Design a binder for this molecule. Structure first.
Ligand SMILES: C=CCCn1cc(-c2cccc(C(=O)N(C)C)c2)c2cc[nH]c2c1=O
Length: 102
């Protein structure tokens, strides 16, 4: 485990605490979200992010933050603003970037 992997595991733990229902835990399936795979071209979720950390795919914090933002942006594209899923994505995007900067 490299120093970067250790830091990213720390950030990921802190980010996942902000999703207590686990809506972001695993890839979204079309059964749960009809037509999702044809609307969202670059899916992302915390489980995929964990696998990417362990596989050593993130070479910088910047690359990691971009996947986090992608995950939130996908949720704000697929879901309407008045939904639980949109609201959490907006909340966690802003809080997560703040947490990773302080
Ligand atoms: C906020 C997260 C962004 C990703 N995400 C996830 C789900 C989702 C996945 C698995 C289980 C459930 C769930 O617990 N229920 C009750 C359906 C919900 C979902 C459903 C409609 N839109 C989305 C959506 O965008």
């Amino acid at each position: 485990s490299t120093p970067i992997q250790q830091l990213l595991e720390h950030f990921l733990r802190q980010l996942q605490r902000k999703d207590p229902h686990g809506f972001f835990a695993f890839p979204v399936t079309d059964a749960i979200a009809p037509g999702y795979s044809m609307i969202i071209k670059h899916p992302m979720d915390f489980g995929t992010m964990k696998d990417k950390i362990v596989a050593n795919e993130y070479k910088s914090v910047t690359e990691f933050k971009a996947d986090f933002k992608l995950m939130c942006d996908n949720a704000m594209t697929y879901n309407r603003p008045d939904t639980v899923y949109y609201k959490l994505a907006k909340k966690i995007l802003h809080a997560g970037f703040k947490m990773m900067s302080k």
